[PDB]
Amino acid sequence: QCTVQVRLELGHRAQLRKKPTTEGFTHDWMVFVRGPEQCDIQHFVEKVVFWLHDSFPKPRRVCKEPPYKVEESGYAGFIMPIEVHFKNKEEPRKVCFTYDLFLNLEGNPPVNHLRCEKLTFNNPTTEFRYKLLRAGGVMVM
Numbered sequence: 001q002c003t004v005q006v007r008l009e010l011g012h013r014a015q016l017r018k019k020p021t022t023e024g025f026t027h028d029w030m031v032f033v034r035g036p037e038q039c040d041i042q043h044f045v046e047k048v049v050f051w052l053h054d055s056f057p058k059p060r061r062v063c064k065e066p067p068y069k070v071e072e073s074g075y076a077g078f079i080m081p082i083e084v085h086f087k088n089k090e091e092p093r094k095v096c097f098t099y100d101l102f103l104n105l106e107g108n109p110p111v112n113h114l115r116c117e118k119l120t121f122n123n124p125t126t127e128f129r130y131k132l133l134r135a136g137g138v139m140v141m
């Protein structure tokens, strides 16, 4: 009997692009998944898949190691499925987040947003427990 808790941070930055008036993309943005400082989520994260809007070239963006991030230009915000896959041999194998990638419209200052997620693993295998603790995970009885 034990629970191991680990922390993910999802976030994004967005700002106006300065290029020619005839390039349609108004914004640069960057979306990420990371650990808190001094945690190494690579120990328990196999890969992160960012599912961009269908209009993007190769919209299924895979990061198999850090940094887990996509840097793009665009003309609109959208809802981004973000899948974090685990180095786990049993369930759960992954978690899906629905990430609100919104841009700064109407001359508002840049977006710099963080969304903090706690993952709770009940009774993980010996092996996966060690990966979670190795990543800076916390046990509970």
Ligand SMILES: O=C(Nc1ccc2nc(CN3CCCCC3)[nH]c2c1)c1ccc(Cl)cc1
Residues within 6 Å of the ligand: 025, 053, 055, 056, 057, 072, 073, 074, 075, 076, 077, 078
């Ligand atoms: O912004 C949107 N679509 C889009 C489409 C194609 C794009 N190609 C780039 C430029 N990159 C190409 C690959 C290499 C790096 C540069 N940015 C794009 C953005 C979008 C967002 C939300 C809705 Cl609802 C609809 C459309």
